[PDB]
Design a protein around this motif. Structure first.
Motif, PDB file in Angstrom:
ATOM      1  N   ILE A  32      67.476  33.876  28.632  1.00  0.00           N
ATOM      2  CA  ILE A  32      68.384  33.031  27.867  1.00  0.00           C
ATOM      3  C   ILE A  32      68.704  33.753  26.556  1.00  0.00           C
ATOM      4  O   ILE A  32      67.972  34.651  26.130  1.00  0.00           O
ATOM      5  CB  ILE A  32      67.767  31.638  27.581  1.00  0.00           C
ATOM      6  N   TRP A  33      69.828  33.373  25.938  1.00  0.00           N
ATOM      7  CA  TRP A  33      70.247  33.897  24.634  1.00  0.00           C
ATOM      8  C   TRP A  33      71.036  32.820  23.899  1.00  0.00           C
ATOM      9  O   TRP A  33      71.430  31.798  24.471  1.00  0.00           O
ATOM     10  CB  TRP A  33      71.104  35.183  24.755  1.00  0.00           C
ATOM     11  N   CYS A  34      71.261  33.065  22.604  1.00  0.00           N
ATOM     12  CA  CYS A  34      72.121  32.237  21.783  1.00  0.00           C
ATOM     13  C   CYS A  34      72.654  33.121  20.666  1.00  0.00           C
ATOM     14  O   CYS A  34      71.913  33.927  20.102  1.00  0.00           O
ATOM     15  CB  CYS A  34      71.386  31.011  21.211  1.00  0.00           C
ATOM     16  N   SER A  35      73.941  33.000  20.378  1.00  0.00           N
ATOM     17  CA  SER A  35      74.531  33.787  19.308  1.00  0.00           C
ATOM     18  C   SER A  35      74.936  32.831  18.183  1.00  0.00           C
ATOM     19  O   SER A  35      74.541  31.654  18.171  1.00  0.00           O
ATOM     20  CB  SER A  35      75.705  34.614  19.855  1.00  0.00           C
ATOM     21  N   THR A  36      75.710  33.339  17.225  1.00  0.00           N
ATOM     22  CA  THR A  36      76.281  32.468  16.208  1.00  0.00           C
ATOM     23  C   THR A  36      77.316  31.540  16.847  1.00  0.00           C
ATOM     24  O   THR A  36      77.653  31.662  18.029  1.00  0.00           O
ATOM     25  CB  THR A  36      76.929  33.288  15.089  1.00  0.00           C
ATOM     26  N   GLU A  37      77.825  30.594  16.051  1.00  0.00           N
ATOM     27  CA  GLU A  37      78.924  29.755  16.523  1.00  0.00           C
ATOM     28  C   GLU A  37      80.094  30.612  16.999  1.00  0.00           C
ATOM     29  O   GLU A  37      80.502  30.542  18.165  1.00  0.00           O
ATOM     30  CB  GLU A  37      79.372  28.789  15.420  1.00  0.00           C
ATOM     31  N   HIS A  38      80.628  31.458  16.116  1.00  0.00           N
ATOM     32  CA  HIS A  38      81.773  32.268  16.522  1.00  0.00           C
ATOM     33  C   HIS A  38      81.382  33.307  17.574  1.00  0.00           C
ATOM     34  O   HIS A  38      82.203  33.642  18.436  1.00  0.00           O
ATOM     35  CB  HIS A  38      82.440  32.890  15.282  1.00  0.00           C
ATOM     36  N   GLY A  39      80.128  33.774  17.564  1.00  0.00           N
ATOM     37  CA  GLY A  39      79.664  34.646  18.636  1.00  0.00           C
ATOM     38  C   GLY A  39      79.626  33.938  19.975  1.00  0.00           C
ATOM     39  O   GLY A  39      80.167  34.430  20.969  1.00  0.00           O
ATOM     40  N   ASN A  40      78.997  32.757  20.014  1.00  0.00           N
ATOM     41  CA  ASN A  40      78.970  31.950  21.233  1.00  0.00           C
ATOM     42  C   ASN A  40      80.377  31.680  21.767  1.00  0.00           C
ATOM     43  O   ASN A  40      80.622  31.783  22.974  1.00  0.00           O
ATOM     44  CB  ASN A  40      78.257  30.628  20.956  1.00  0.00           C
ATOM     45  N   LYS A  41      81.316  31.340  20.883  1.00  0.00           N
ATOM     46  CA  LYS A  41      82.682  31.071  21.330  1.00  0.00           C
ATOM     47  C   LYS A  41      83.309  32.307  21.968  1.00  0.00           C
ATOM     48  O   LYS A  41      83.983  32.215  22.999  1.00  0.00           O
ATOM     49  CB  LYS A  41      83.528  30.578  20.153  1.00  0.00           C
ATOM     50  N   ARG A  42      83.070  33.476  21.388  1.00  0.00           N
ATOM     51  CA  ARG A  42      83.674  34.694  21.907  1.00  0.00           C
ATOM     52  C   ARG A  42      83.138  35.004  23.291  1.00  0.00           C
ATOM     53  O   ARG A  42      83.904  35.296  24.224  1.00  0.00           O
ATOM     54  CB  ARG A  42      83.392  35.845  20.944  1.00  0.00           C
ATOM     55  N   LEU A  43      81.813  34.941  23.444  1.00  0.00           N
ATOM     56  CA  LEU A  43      81.204  35.266  24.729  1.00  0.00           C
ATOM     57  C   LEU A  43      81.594  34.241  25.783  1.00  0.00           C
ATOM     58  O   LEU A  43      81.895  34.596  26.933  1.00  0.00           O
ATOM     59  CB  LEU A  43      79.683  35.338  24.567  1.00  0.00           C
ATOM     60  N   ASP A  44      81.598  32.966  25.397  1.00  0.00           N
ATOM     61  CA  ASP A  44      81.927  31.886  26.321  1.00  0.00           C
ATOM     62  C   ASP A  44      83.343  32.063  26.869  1.00  0.00           C
ATOM     63  O   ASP A  44      83.572  31.976  28.084  1.00  0.00           O
ATOM     64  CB  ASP A  44      81.773  30.546  25.592  1.00  0.00           C
ATOM     65  N   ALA A  45      84.303  32.339  25.980  1.00  0.00           N
ATOM     66  CA  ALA A  45      85.678  32.575  26.418  1.00  0.00           C
ATOM     67  C   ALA A  45      85.751  33.743  27.389  1.00  0.00           C
ATOM     68  O   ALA A  45      86.457  33.677  28.403  1.00  0.00           O
ATOM     69  CB  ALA A  45      86.572  32.833  25.207  1.00  0.00           C
ATOM     70  N   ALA A  46      85.023  34.828  27.097  1.00  0.00           N
ATOM     71  CA  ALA A  46      85.038  35.977  27.993  1.00  0.00           C
ATOM     72  C   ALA A  46      84.395  35.644  29.329  1.00  0.00           C
ATOM     73  O   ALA A  46      84.861  36.110  30.379  1.00  0.00           O
ATOM     74  CB  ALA A  46      84.331  37.169  27.342  1.00  0.00           C
ATOM     75  N   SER A 126      78.109  48.796  15.179  1.00  0.00           N
ATOM     76  CA  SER A 126      78.801  47.566  15.517  1.00  0.00           C
ATOM     77  C   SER A 126      78.058  46.351  14.953  1.00  0.00           C
ATOM     78  O   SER A 126      76.850  46.381  14.704  1.00  0.00           O
ATOM     79  CB  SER A 126      78.921  47.448  17.046  1.00  0.00           C
ATOM     80  N   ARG A 127      78.807  45.280  14.755  1.00  0.00           N
ATOM     81  CA  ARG A 127      78.291  43.974  14.395  1.00  0.00           C
ATOM     82  C   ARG A 127      78.041  43.154  15.663  1.00  0.00           C
ATOM     83  O   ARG A 127      78.505  43.494  16.760  1.00  0.00           O
ATOM     84  CB  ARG A 127      79.290  43.258  13.489  1.00  0.00           C
ATOM     85  N   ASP A 128      77.329  42.041  15.496  1.00  0.00           N
ATOM     86  CA  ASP A 128      77.046  41.151  16.618  1.00  0.00           C
ATOM     87  C   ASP A 128      78.332  40.684  17.309  1.00  0.00           C
ATOM     88  O   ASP A 128      79.298  40.272  16.658  1.00  0.00           O
ATOM     89  CB  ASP A 128      76.225  39.942  16.139  1.00  0.00           C
ATOM     90  N   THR A 129      78.312  40.755  18.641  1.00  0.00           N
ATOM     91  CA  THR A 129      79.407  40.400  19.567  1.00  0.00           C
ATOM     92  C   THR A 129      80.696  41.196  19.333  1.00  0.00           C
ATOM     93  O   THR A 129      81.783  40.764  19.723  1.00  0.00           O
ATOM     94  CB  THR A 129      79.686  38.889  19.598  1.00  0.00           C
TER      95      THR A 129
END
Ligand SMILES: CCc1[nH]c(=O)[nH]c(=O)c1N
Ligand SMILES: [Cl-]
Ligand SMILES: [Cl-]
Length: 148
Positions: A32-46, A126-129
């Motif tokens: 399992i993983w969890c990113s930031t709010e904007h990180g989670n949104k980016r990965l989820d969309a992809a 690179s930065r996260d996500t």
């Protein structure tokens, strides 16, 4: 010759930057993983727009560590309302991954690969996500798989 990665034409690849070795350990243990709010949104969309047509790969690196520590594939959309406080610092939500490679790969092996979508900076800066263009991702994956 090893031409495996050069032939994949679907898939999206993101850098994951974590401050915490504990979170890495927990991720490998429980997939399992969890990113930031904007990180989670980016990965989820992809993940959702990929519709099982190809993988979403995560290239993991601990901030300040000098190396990547492995590779995982995203394996679910983001669930945004889950138990709080399961990570080192008290993150909103959770998604499933599957770690497919756990190996330290020095940044020296990778710093010559640059991201045209990030001002031509080395992939190792690179930065996260940060997303990685697929033709650069193929090069990174081959180096990680080849490192001894
Ligand atoms: C909760 C896992 C996580 N996710 C993130 O985006 N940054 C970090 O430092 C980290 N430890
Ligand atoms: Cl492994
Ligand atoms: Cl470096």
């Amino acid at each position: 010759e090893n031409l495996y990665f050069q032939h994949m034409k679907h898939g999206r690849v993101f850098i994951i930057k974590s401050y915490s070795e504990d979170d890495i350990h927990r991720s490998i243990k429980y997939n399992i993983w969890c990113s930031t709010e904007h990180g989670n949104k980016r990965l989820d969309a992809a993940y959702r727009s990929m519709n099982g047509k190809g993988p979403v790969y995560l290239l993991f690196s601990v901030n300040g560590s000098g190396h990547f520590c492995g590779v995982a594939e995203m394996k679910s959309a983001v669930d945004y309302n889950t138990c709080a406080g399961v990570w080192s610092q008290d993150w909103k939500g959770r998604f499933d991954v599957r770690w497919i490679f756990v190996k330290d790969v020095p940044n020296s092996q990778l710093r010559h690969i640059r991201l045209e979508n990030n001002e031509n900076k080395p992939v190792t800066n690179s930065r996260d996500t940060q997303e990685v263009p697929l033709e650069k991702a193929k090069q990174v994956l081959k180096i990680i798989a080849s490192y001894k």
